[PDB]
Symmetry: C3
Subunit: 222 residues, 3 copies
């Protein structure tokens, strides 16, 4: 359509759509309770991402925010996505290591603060304060990874699986704050169609790529 980034919003829609169906079909048969939990959490992520990617493609998940003497197109639907999918992804990691709820509660709530403050920053009409919310949001992210590393006798199937997904999680997640900072939301460096491509490549890897590495392992069974 009229927006150059349309193609990446369409490709993301498409890829999130087929990953859900792939994980749906694969969960066909599963009766192991715990396996039943990873399949639930992991199928719902691109399911949710699917709808939010489609709401961006179709124009609904977009809004104008004025600042720097311009009217900026901001896709708020990403934060409706992450708000639910990022604790679900952290949920996947925690269950995996059998995290006590005290740690789960800090992960989920720090996660909500990260996204919520991510969202406020995205919609704030005063240019410099946008970067204050980013920083707060980055401290929550930097908190989660900390617990991801020093916040946790596991079976060696869960460990390796865990180490794999923890590194894939730090590398992709830590790229989101960078992308936002240089993109349309912040400094206006990287064009909106390139950032939409970066977020698409990260989203698909963080959800479907993350999902294929997880459900492909016996780490999920009890």
């Amino acid at each position: 359509t009229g927006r150059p980034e349309w193609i990446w919003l369409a490709l993301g829609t498409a890829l999130m759509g087929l990953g859900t169906l792939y994980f749906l079909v694969k969960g066909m048969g599963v009766s192991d309770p715990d396996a039943k939990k990873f399949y639930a959490i992991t199928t719902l992520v691109p399911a949710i991402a699917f709808t939010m990617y489609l709401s961006m493609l179709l124009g609904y998940g977009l809004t104008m925010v004025p600042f720097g003497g311009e009217q900026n197109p901001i896709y708020w639907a990403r934060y409706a996505d992450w708000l639910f999918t990022t604790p679900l992804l952290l949920l996947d990691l925690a269950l995996l290591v059998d995290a006590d709820q005290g740690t789960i509660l800090a992960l989920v709530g720090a996660d909500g603060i990260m996204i919520g403050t991510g969202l406020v920053g995205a919609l704030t009409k005063v240019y410099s304060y946008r970067f204050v919310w980013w920083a707060i949001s980055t401290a929550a992210m930097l908190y989660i990874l900390y617990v991801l590393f020093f916040g946790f006798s596991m079976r060696p199937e869960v460990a390796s699986t865990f180490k794999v997904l923890r590194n894939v999680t730090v590398v992709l997640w830590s790229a989101y704050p960078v992308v936002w900072l240089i993109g349309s939301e912040g400094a206006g460096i990287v064009p909106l169609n390139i950032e939409t491509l970066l977020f698409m490549v990260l989203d698909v890897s963080a959800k479907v790529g993350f999902g294929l590495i997880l459900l492909r392992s016996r780490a999920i069974f009890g």
Copy 2:
């Protein structure tokens, strides 16, 4: 008042109001833990519905959406209702059969997608895409019922009670997509005051009627 559908918004308010009070009083005494769970979930549903029905009566839960060359009155407060009351209703059914959390997590999250995509459809300004969100929302509904039927050795008190409420649940819930499709939200076939009556009759049966059949049985005790 000025809106013809006012009378059904007032009758729903009223009926949701007295069902909460009826279930509140009835839970007076209950000390059985599990009974304590069905009473919690089941009292909260028309409690929440009460407030959302009243916000519609008083005008707050309503907004204009433009499309088809008209300004359409859309009651968004229904989705604030369902978003919380429909997982609670599915929660009632699951606990009842002692569903593993893997199934509960898929039910609740598929439910959120159904309502959330229901909501996006309701507020989308491009007429044909309204029907795309409906369809997605109907696939999630059709998913839940599937699990409602083929997604689950229970005591025979829970089974019969369960079968009763599962059929009452498929019959009423499956009517909501029909009503939306022919009503103000979609094709503009059935007038807004008639749809408001249909949703009122379904809501009251799905919550209070569903609640009286459930808490009236010993299926709820352990």
Copy 3:
């Protein structure tokens, strides 16, 4: 800045900020699972309050609502705060007494109704109905305290700790409906900068003061 209440929004920001850091540092070391739960819930409260207090200071968590022939400044960010922090505070009390989930589910859901109806009232454009939502919201509050008192063999460390926090909870919480009624949201009696001071003093006591009395006791360990 230009708003006289700025100073109290800045002082609250500041105090919520240092209480989080204080509780964060203190949770450093903790490995007792249950202790890990009170520290999670209790650190997140002024953490969340911090962000919401800052969004009010910076102007984002504020909006104009017209009524009584005036344009009223309403800080909606308080309800984004409470919506998450008040069930967390009730969560702290319940875990403490080892509440069955039936009671927890009624507490959290009655709490959501209190805040949600608090919020609707705050944004309602018809002056008298504002007071209807308050009343409904006060019935939910009056419900929670009821369960706080007659809705529950505990260790005597939890009891005393519990009694302490239950009284501090009834006294501060019951003051919020009073403040709203006489402030900018309702009758327009107490000026906005004084109410912002009252809510600040209550918020800080209800969260950080409440937090220091709680985590300072061995009531939290198993």
